[PDB]
Every structure is written in structure tokens, then in C-alpha cells.
Amino acid sequence: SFHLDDINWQPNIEGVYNSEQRFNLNDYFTSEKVPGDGNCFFYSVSFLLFESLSEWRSIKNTIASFAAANWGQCVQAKLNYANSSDYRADMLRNYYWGGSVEAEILSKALNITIILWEADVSENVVTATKYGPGLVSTALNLKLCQGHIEPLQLMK
């Protein structure tokens, strides 16, 4: 649109919002490069919270604590795993690929909003999914492109 914070988000009853808006990410966001291994979701979240990659494992620990105490709120994780114990053992391993399951949990665990912007190779939004009630400008904006996750920041 004209302002990212004026996008129209459509919630489902699970509290996940979707947006059909289609624009080019790089007209509104600066991208940042993180190393392209299987930890990139966690590198990206760490970059946006701390301006450093070094906190990526502790973000996993925060997710794990939420999954242990609040498994019934881990809606997407419950589709993929029989119990919180199985989930935590898998997610905590190196090169576990983060995605919507972790975005949903982290948004609740840290009281932040996380947006997964699925992009094609030319950086056009294909799907946008927002976890949490907040606005684009306050969210952790993640670009999902060609199997890798990179942090985005609002331009200027």
C-alpha cells in the first residue's frame, strides 16, 4: 500500500492474520543478510531483537520454555508433534529450520508481533502472515525467500 501500518490484515479465529496485499518488499524494507544455514530463522530474530546474531540459541530456549508451560497455545506445533517434549527435543537441535510454528510461539512468548513475508525470487510478496496483534512497524518482519529467512527493517 502506501504505509505498511495501514495494511488490511484478516484474522482467523486462531489469532493468525493473513494479508493478500502484493507489493515489492524492497520498496518499504531494507533487507539484512544473515548466514544461510538452518539456524537462519533464529539468526534473523536475534538480529532484529539485539542487532547481533549471538542470542539465537537463547531465543530457542525462550521458545522451549513457552512450549513446556503453554503447549495448548502452540497450535501449529501440535499439528506436527505429539507432545511438547518431542517438539522441544527437535527444535533445540542445530539446523532445525524455523518457520510459522516458531513464529507463532515466539510472538506469544515475547509479546511481540512477527510477520512472515513469503516472497518470490524478485522479492514480491506472495503471502503475508502475521502472528500477534501489533503493527508492521513494531513487528519482527521476516523475509522468506527461496528457502532462506532474512530479517527486514523499515526503510529510512
Side-chain angles (χ1 to χ4, degrees), residues 107-119:
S107 72
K108 300 165 182 200
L110 291 183
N111 283 90
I112 60 183
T113 290
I114 300 171
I115 300 173
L116 307 186
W117 300 93
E118 279 163 64

PDB file of all heavy atoms in Angstrom, residues 107-119:
ATOM      1  N   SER A 107       5.986 -15.086  19.106  1.00  0.00           N
ATOM      2  CA  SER A 107       5.112 -13.922  19.273  1.00  0.00           C
ATOM      3  C   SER A 107       4.407 -13.949  20.622  1.00  0.00           C
ATOM      4  O   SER A 107       4.340 -12.917  21.329  1.00  0.00           O
ATOM      5  CB  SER A 107       4.103 -13.884  18.143  1.00  0.00           C
ATOM      6  OG  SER A 107       3.121 -14.884  18.239  1.00  0.00           O
ATOM      7  N   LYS A 108       3.903 -15.127  21.021  1.00  0.00           N
ATOM      8  CA  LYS A 108       3.311 -15.224  22.344  1.00  0.00           C
ATOM      9  C   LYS A 108       4.381 -15.164  23.443  1.00  0.00           C
ATOM     10  O   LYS A 108       4.173 -14.527  24.479  1.00  0.00           O
ATOM     11  CB  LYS A 108       2.500 -16.521  22.457  1.00  0.00           C
ATOM     12  CG  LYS A 108       1.355 -16.621  21.433  1.00  0.00           C
ATOM     13  CD  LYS A 108       0.773 -18.022  21.267  1.00  0.00           C
ATOM     14  CE  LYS A 108      -0.341 -17.997  20.170  1.00  0.00           C
ATOM     15  NZ  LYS A 108      -1.269 -19.178  20.275  1.00  0.00           N
ATOM     16  N   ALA A 109       5.531 -15.816  23.241  1.00  0.00           N
ATOM     17  CA  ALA A 109       6.460 -15.935  24.360  1.00  0.00           C
ATOM     18  C   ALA A 109       7.070 -14.593  24.734  1.00  0.00           C
ATOM     19  O   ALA A 109       7.423 -14.371  25.901  1.00  0.00           O
ATOM     20  CB  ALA A 109       7.543 -16.958  24.020  1.00  0.00           C
ATOM     21  N   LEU A 110       7.262 -13.704  23.744  1.00  0.00           N
ATOM     22  CA  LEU A 110       7.895 -12.425  23.986  1.00  0.00           C
ATOM     23  C   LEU A 110       6.932 -11.258  23.877  1.00  0.00           C
ATOM     24  O   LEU A 110       7.364 -10.110  24.069  1.00  0.00           O
ATOM     25  CB  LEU A 110       9.069 -12.234  22.977  1.00  0.00           C
ATOM     26  CG  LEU A 110      10.235 -13.170  23.214  1.00  0.00           C
ATOM     27  CD1 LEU A 110      11.341 -12.805  22.192  1.00  0.00           C
ATOM     28  CD2 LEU A 110      10.778 -13.079  24.646  1.00  0.00           C
ATOM     29  N   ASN A 111       5.645 -11.508  23.620  1.00  0.00           N
ATOM     30  CA  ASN A 111       4.679 -10.405  23.488  1.00  0.00           C
ATOM     31  C   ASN A 111       5.141  -9.447  22.408  1.00  0.00           C
ATOM     32  O   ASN A 111       5.236  -8.220  22.586  1.00  0.00           O
ATOM     33  CB  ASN A 111       4.466  -9.679  24.816  1.00  0.00           C
ATOM     34  CG  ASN A 111       3.584 -10.469  25.711  1.00  0.00           C
ATOM     35  OD1 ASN A 111       4.059 -11.305  26.496  1.00  0.00           O
ATOM     36  ND2 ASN A 111       2.282 -10.281  25.542  1.00  0.00           N
ATOM     37  N   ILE A 112       5.473 -10.033  21.276  1.00  0.00           N
ATOM     38  CA  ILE A 112       5.858  -9.267  20.117  1.00  0.00           C
ATOM     39  C   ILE A 112       5.027  -9.793  18.956  1.00  0.00           C
ATOM     40  O   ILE A 112       4.342 -10.815  19.040  1.00  0.00           O
ATOM     41  CB  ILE A 112       7.375  -9.352  19.809  1.00  0.00           C
ATOM     42  CG1 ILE A 112       7.763 -10.792  19.560  1.00  0.00           C
ATOM     43  CG2 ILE A 112       8.202  -8.753  20.973  1.00  0.00           C
ATOM     44  CD1 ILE A 112       9.289 -11.090  19.306  1.00  0.00           C
ATOM     45  N   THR A 113       5.085  -9.046  17.870  1.00  0.00           N
ATOM     46  CA  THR A 113       4.402  -9.446  16.654  1.00  0.00           C
ATOM     47  C   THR A 113       5.468  -9.842  15.661  1.00  0.00           C
ATOM     48  O   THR A 113       6.502  -9.149  15.556  1.00  0.00           O
ATOM     49  CB  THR A 113       3.536  -8.277  16.156  1.00  0.00           C
ATOM     50  OG1 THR A 113       2.443  -8.116  17.091  1.00  0.00           O
ATOM     51  CG2 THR A 113       2.878  -8.571  14.790  1.00  0.00           C
ATOM     52  N   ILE A 114       5.219 -10.941  14.933  1.00  0.00           N
ATOM     53  CA  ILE A 114       6.157 -11.444  13.949  1.00  0.00           C
ATOM     54  C   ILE A 114       5.413 -11.632  12.647  1.00  0.00           C
ATOM     55  O   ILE A 114       4.317 -12.190  12.642  1.00  0.00           O
ATOM     56  CB  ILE A 114       6.821 -12.768  14.379  1.00  0.00           C
ATOM     57  CG1 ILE A 114       7.591 -12.531  15.713  1.00  0.00           C
ATOM     58  CG2 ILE A 114       7.678 -13.308  13.193  1.00  0.00           C
ATOM     59  CD1 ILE A 114       8.135 -13.847  16.385  1.00  0.00           C
ATOM     60  N   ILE A 115       5.983 -11.143  11.550  1.00  0.00           N
ATOM     61  CA  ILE A 115       5.327 -11.259  10.252  1.00  0.00           C
ATOM     62  C   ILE A 115       6.231 -12.039   9.322  1.00  0.00           C
ATOM     63  O   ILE A 115       7.415 -11.708   9.182  1.00  0.00           O
ATOM     64  CB  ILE A 115       4.997  -9.882   9.662  1.00  0.00           C
ATOM     65  CG1 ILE A 115       4.082  -9.159  10.624  1.00  0.00           C
ATOM     66  CG2 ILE A 115       4.400 -10.019   8.226  1.00  0.00           C
ATOM     67  CD1 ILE A 115       3.820  -7.660  10.196  1.00  0.00           C
ATOM     68  N   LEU A 116       5.677 -13.076   8.695  1.00  0.00           N
ATOM     69  CA  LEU A 116       6.418 -13.854   7.715  1.00  0.00           C
ATOM     70  C   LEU A 116       5.966 -13.373   6.355  1.00  0.00           C
ATOM     71  O   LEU A 116       4.812 -13.588   5.966  1.00  0.00           O
ATOM     72  CB  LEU A 116       6.185 -15.357   7.866  1.00  0.00           C
ATOM     73  CG  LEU A 116       6.416 -15.954   9.261  1.00  0.00           C
ATOM     74  CD1 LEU A 116       6.306 -17.538   9.265  1.00  0.00           C
ATOM     75  CD2 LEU A 116       7.739 -15.458   9.852  1.00  0.00           C
ATOM     76  N   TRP A 117       6.872 -12.702   5.626  1.00  0.00           N
ATOM     77  CA  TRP A 117       6.561 -12.224   4.291  1.00  0.00           C
ATOM     78  C   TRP A 117       7.140 -13.254   3.332  1.00  0.00           C
ATOM     79  O   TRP A 117       8.356 -13.317   3.131  1.00  0.00           O
ATOM     80  CB  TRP A 117       7.215 -10.869   4.035  1.00  0.00           C
ATOM     81  CG  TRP A 117       6.783  -9.763   4.985  1.00  0.00           C
ATOM     82  CD1 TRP A 117       7.407  -9.389   6.162  1.00  0.00           C
ATOM     83  CD2 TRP A 117       5.658  -8.890   4.830  1.00  0.00           C
ATOM     84  NE1 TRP A 117       6.764  -8.313   6.714  1.00  0.00           N
ATOM     85  CE2 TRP A 117       5.682  -7.990   5.924  1.00  0.00           C
ATOM     86  CE3 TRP A 117       4.648  -8.770   3.868  1.00  0.00           C
ATOM     87  CZ2 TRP A 117       4.710  -7.031   6.137  1.00  0.00           C
ATOM     88  CZ3 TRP A 117       3.662  -7.762   4.069  1.00  0.00           C
ATOM     89  CH2 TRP A 117       3.709  -6.918   5.182  1.00  0.00           C
ATOM     90  N   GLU A 118       6.281 -14.068   2.731  1.00  0.00           N
ATOM     91  CA  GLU A 118       6.738 -15.001   1.716  1.00  0.00           C
ATOM     92  C   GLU A 118       6.847 -14.267   0.398  1.00  0.00           C
ATOM     93  O   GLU A 118       5.860 -13.710  -0.106  1.00  0.00           O
ATOM     94  CB  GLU A 118       5.809 -16.205   1.619  1.00  0.00           C
ATOM     95  CG  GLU A 118       6.146 -17.218   2.735  1.00  0.00           C
ATOM     96  CD  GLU A 118       5.064 -18.253   3.000  1.00  0.00           C
ATOM     97  OE1 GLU A 118       4.783 -19.064   2.086  1.00  0.00           O
ATOM     98  OE2 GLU A 118       4.508 -18.257   4.127  1.00  0.00           O
ATOM     99  N   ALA A 119       8.063 -14.337  -0.190  1.00  0.00           N
ATOM    100  CA  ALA A 119       8.456 -13.571  -1.349  1.00  0.00           C
ATOM    101  C   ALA A 119       8.880 -14.515  -2.456  1.00  0.00           C
ATOM    102  O   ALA A 119       9.464 -15.582  -2.192  1.00  0.00           O
ATOM    103  CB  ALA A 119       9.639 -12.628  -1.015  1.00  0.00           C
TER     104      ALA A 119
END
